[PDB]
Design a binder for this molecule. Structure first.
Ligand SMILES: Cc1ccc2cc(CC3CCN(C(=O)c4cc(-c5ccccc5)nc5ccccc45)CC3)ccc2n1
Ligand SMILES: Cc1ccc2cc(CC3CCN(C(=O)c4cc(-c5ccccc5)nc5ccccc45)CC3)ccc2n1
Lengths: 696, 696
């Protein structure tokens, strides 16, 4: 016992494994449910300071496998785990789910054979993944490991012999490894006969059993651990499309551990905890030179957060757990359940205060969440304090996060208008390599920002099942040599693919001072997914194939400018050339203005390419009721789908809308939402009566 | 008429549009079906030189929209197209489909408004895509365009007036653009009232109609072309997952044209024909410096073929058409039809001649397709002349292509064992940028080669619907700083995702002299997709978590080596240190051999991680019958699926196998395939009788 005379019992002495996990710079596995309780208690405190929580608000039950390999809940003392993988089923009352929400927490035990993954740990992690998937509940993975377990047949070590080329001179070489009759007998005795595959031979009177293959009696030495690693890699790939998946990197995550981080997609990395494949010293041995200094050089946050492999960083394990809990607050309690509404002080019924200006630099986050000023807070489009930014270390030209609109959770994608700089590190393996600073113009999609946008769309859709708003403001894609060589077309195409797959309502909105041109419009047009997408443009937004400079270059050339001077200038209508020299700068401005007059939201409305033209200050009120109406109609379309056999979206929506009273304006979002909400049970009666269907 | 006195009529005079397409360095649209006839005739000549083809072997029928917008077949004179998009339905008798196969060819007409995409061209291209998708037939796109159509309201050009700040001094500026009563009347007269949105004002006695927005009477000016571009981008994204999609870049492909190339995935680029977004001169104007010299610098084959955006290059349009036809020869006639068997001179019943050696450098293509030697041809694993390599300009560390195994078409992925070099061009926009040469070690996955592998798996699965063989031979992934920063984990994870989605049989085979370690095994393990995947290892292959050097470093350390010297060396069992110095180099070799003895295919079999251990020379015979048996069982599993409502793969296969006579060995591939093929109609009788099912 160290230390002596403490007021309460020494937990690191009661369970020495707790001390071992601490020495490795991580939380002991069995202490993680307490971090989740602390983080959930903080959630309530930030939401409503006066709430009185009792311990029954949070329940953690360890999951273990019974005799039949089926998962069962247990209450046992920490550290009794016979495998290096542990899991907990958590039931917690949260501000968004005050009656309770559930999720599973899977975690490596860093104290159990260094958190290595053997076949038993792989099979348990897979069983836990399937358990969560069957229930539709989130799967949280706490990564603290050493990758696949590695071993040798330790029983053959004191038994094997060597067929020396020259017995007197060992340095001269050897032919093979073998066992003697007594070696074979030792194996026969301990029932380890199948530990080796041998070929009996006789050399100078003595029978030698030539070792052809070493198998070993102990399970979890090599290939069997690689099979289990593949199983859990595929399981995680599947889980990402099915349930909400997230990983906290709490101590190192090696090999399969690094792949699990990425396969679950959503990842929070604790600072100083590396995500690696082969380590620095192993790499150095292969390279035959001291190239790398540390594992943190290979997989620290300055690699992974800058990459977008880590969506967020955390200063410590509790900060990481808090970020999991905060991320989950935007996510349904289980698969296919409605998105969790959480109304706060900042109600839908207000104008948007922060307005961008053409003559002034702004941070898009101000438009999203608002900004603090000396004269008071300027409210943004979304709820005050609701913006949760993710992938904040990578491709900063695009701003992605979760926010709330009058309480409705949604994914938000905005455009950073300021020039973004990123530092490409010098390659330690190349002596002729130096660090590169890359500058990327604002409102231009680059390979990295296009990849981040596609990734965001997929992460809001899969597991999170959230509606989305893109505040579309791009001039185009980078068509330059470097970015074209770096496959900008591939990443831009991933955006189209991500939108095709989207299952919840989408709002595309060109904001005030905003623009959408050529290739940038293409990749975000609502006809990519007409079932879910709608486009809107601000009265102060612009859009066309080219910018006015481009349009004039192709369609308002010198001949047309001169005919315009001929019509409009009395002096014009060698003495022409000097007049042309004087008129050209202003006539170039007239032509640019003429072109800009086509790029208005009024032309977008007339041509039917946008649903409506909007005023920014009224966009919060408009979008709140539009989104609320859309969620309600989507619920009814899904109910009608359950009883038909075969009908299109257009036919399903036309039928639902035919149930609305004649006096209801189908174009009034607030009226449609209000009527549906007042009639959910009446609509249920109607849907249940439609089960008079016999379709073959 | 130019030239005069030709033996036959001047086609470039009869149809001047033919001459215009030629002046633009491309085939005239209406001459493309003839290139397909020429290429299909060549297919027959290469297959069986003595075949007698008549003109009824190939039929091309132009598709146009009728009064109701429905596609109908027409026989009309070339050049009568009222839109800049044309399509043909092709019916061709090929060596793989001697009774005929069909596909659609969609193409821009470069002579029609520079191949620009207006709303009508977009709607026709979408209608053609849907037509092919509904029928399950391939969609071939011939890209020769200028992107989205750009325009202005040309009727407002001679009408608009300017509100000068000072009428006498135009240079001093202007307030707005306006129309007069006579301007408004001109618009009223020609029924173009809605061409502008105006605001009537009176300034110094005269009524001025202030132009607030220019709309225009002509359709296809701006945003409406961007909507149509989005529609066809989404349509192509969908088509790729549904039917076989391919694009030939035959003249430039701009904007939406560049996106269509990528969205259809499979692309052949004719040399000197660029795939661009914004062009060089437009980019130069934005950058305010002469940065780029040409469009070919931005999107030539040296960009796109090196990127993997272009799967192949072609010296000319006919070479391109021939490569389409050759690619299609491995693909089913329509969606869900069986893969086309094409038996040639090189029959299944032979050993594999080319065998790799540990002490000698080899090209993996020799193992795949064989090699010419002075002593004769050394046959490879696959049919002689059947290897069709694709993505050959990009990530050369991985070799991808289509091949045939005793006539069975399949996707093949092999590993290039030689060091691969690639040249990263100097960024023209950065004066402080120079070209970089990157060397990549063989048998190591890098971000580019991992992306190429995932891309290949997806392209064999989607549309092609082919079985696959991966000749798995990777030591691991590059875990170094540069490759980790360059997101190797993301690309490696895409491999897992691509395997999860795979719908046809997969063979993973570790070849002779081959190896599969740590992270490389993980990403290719058959438990990722147990319904489709099987793994095999050569008797001369190796596999474990680490390489023997790594295993000894962790599990056979100095203490263990010294205890081994204590047991095996009579002299060992300060006078120890000098003995240690002498023994250590050979005892290090013993420990490496001890570790290598665990890495054998015999341990893989014993641990149940591979289906069988094989001998390379017998692999062609083994895999032919294994694949043939698997295709037959897959056909029956799909038939059983059509009549059940709910049953797992394991239950479906167990039922099918219960139909085999008792004397049939379920493990004998050749016997199982033979029995199924002799009993297809009898099995059909049994399946039709199982339609006594009433499941609710
Ligand atoms: C690194 C970088 C930085 C900015 C980028 C902007 C775009 C947008 C397109 C719009 C379409 N387009 C034009 O429409 C255009 C814009 C301008 C232009 C605009 C603003 C200032 C100066 C010039 N001049 C032109 C000249 C000829 C043809 C087209 C134009 C070109 C430019 C694309 C890639 C970019 N890459
Ligand atoms: C650019 C590059 C080049 C080659 C690469 C090879 C690997 C494979 C792993 C296997 C696992 N592993 C070992 O198992 C290992 C191999 C060797 C080694 C092998 C051959 C020659 C020299 C050393 N020495 C070691 C030392 C300590 C720990 C592990 C080892 C390391 C190396 C990964 C990335 C690489 N990147």
């Amino acid at each position: 016992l160290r230390p002596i005379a403490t007021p309460y019992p020494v937990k690191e002495w009661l369970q020495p494994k707790r001390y071992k996990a601490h020495l490795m710079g991580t939380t002991y596995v069995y202490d993680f449910p307490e971090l989740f309780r602390q983080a959930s208690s903080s959630q309530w405190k930030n939401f409503s300071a006066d709430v009185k929580l009792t311990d029954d608000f949070f329940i953690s039950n360890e999951l273990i496998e019974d005799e039949n390999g089926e998962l069962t809940e247990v209450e046992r003392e920490p550290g009794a785990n016979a495998i290096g993988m542990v899991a907990f089923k958590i039931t917690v009352k949260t501000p968004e789910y005050p009656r309770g929400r559930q999720f599973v927490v899977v975690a490596n035990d860093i104290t159990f054979k260094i958190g290595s993954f053997g076949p038993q740990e792989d099979e348990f992690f897979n069983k836990v993944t399937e358990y969560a998937r069957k229930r539709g509940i989130p799967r949280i993975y706490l990564a603290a490991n050493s990758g696949a377990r590695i071993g040798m047949a330790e029983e053959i070590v004191p038994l094997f012999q060597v067929a020396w080329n020259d017995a007197a001179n060992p340095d001269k070489g050897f032919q093979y490894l073998y066992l003697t009759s007594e070696g074979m007998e030792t194996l026969k005795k301990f029932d380890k006969e199948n530990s080796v595959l041998t070929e009996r031979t006789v050399i100078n009177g003595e029978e030698r059993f030539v070792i052809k293959t070493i198998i070993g009696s102990e399970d979890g030495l090599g290939v069997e651990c690689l099979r289990g690693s593949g199983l859990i890699a595929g399981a995680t790939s599947r889980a990402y499309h099915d349930i909400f998946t997230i990983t906290l990197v709490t101590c190192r995550s090696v090999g399969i551990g690094a792949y699990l981080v990425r396969l679950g997609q959503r990842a929070i990395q604790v600072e100083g905890q590396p995500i690696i494949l082969t380590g620095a010293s192993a790499l150095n041995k292969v390279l035959g030179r001291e190239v790398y200094t540390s594992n943190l050089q290979l997989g620290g946050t300055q690699i992974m957060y800058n990459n977008g492999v880590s969506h967020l960083t955390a200063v410590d394990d509790l900060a990481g757990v808090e970020k999991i809990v905060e991320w989950m607050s935007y996510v349904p309690a289980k698969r296919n359940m409605p998105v969790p509404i959480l109304e706060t002080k900042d109600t839908w019924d207000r104008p948007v205060d922060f307005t961008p200006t053409n003559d002034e630099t702004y941070d898009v986050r101000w438009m999203i969440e608002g900004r603090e000023t000396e004269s008071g807070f300027e409210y943004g489009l979304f709820d005050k304090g609701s913006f949760f930014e993710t992938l904040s270390g990578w491709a900063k030209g695009v701003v992605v996060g979760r926010a709330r609109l009058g309480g409705i959770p949604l994914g938000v994608i905005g455009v950073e208008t300021r020039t973004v700089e990123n530092l490409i590190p010098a390659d330690p393996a190349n002596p002729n390599s130096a660090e590169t600073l890359i500058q990327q113009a604002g409102q231009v999609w680059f390979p990295n920002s296009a990849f981040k946008t596609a990734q965001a769309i997929n992460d809001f859709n899969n597991g999170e099942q959230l509606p989305m708003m893109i505040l579309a403001n791009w001039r185009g894609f980078s068509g330059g040599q470097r970015d074209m060589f770096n496959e900008v077309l591939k990443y831009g195409s991933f955006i189209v693919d991500a939108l095709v797959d989207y299952k919840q309502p989408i709002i595309i909105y060109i904001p005030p001072t905003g623009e959408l041109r050529g290739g940038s419009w293409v990749v975000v047009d609502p006809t990519i997914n007409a079932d879910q997408m709608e486009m809107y443009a601000d009265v102060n937004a612009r859009a066309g194939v080219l910018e006015p400079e481009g349009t004039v270059e192709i369609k308002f050339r010198r001949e047309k400018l001169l005919d315009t001077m001929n019509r409009l200038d009395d002096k014009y209508r060698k003495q022409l050339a000097d007049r042309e020299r004087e008129l050209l700068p202003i006539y170039g401005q007239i032509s640019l203005q003429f072109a800009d007059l086509h790029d208005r939201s009024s032309r977008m409305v007339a041509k039917g390419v946008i649903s409506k033209e909007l005023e920014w200050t009224e966009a919060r009120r408009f979008f709140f009721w539009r989104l609320r109406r859309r969620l309600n109609e989507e619920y009814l379309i899904k109910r009608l789908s359950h009883q038909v056999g075969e009908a299109s979206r257009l036919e399903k929506i036309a039928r639902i809308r035919s149930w609305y009273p004649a006096s209801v304006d189908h174009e009034d979002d607030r009226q449609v939402a209000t009527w549906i909400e007042e009639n959910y049970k009446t609509l249920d009666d109607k849907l249940k009566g439609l089960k008079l269907e016999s379709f073959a």
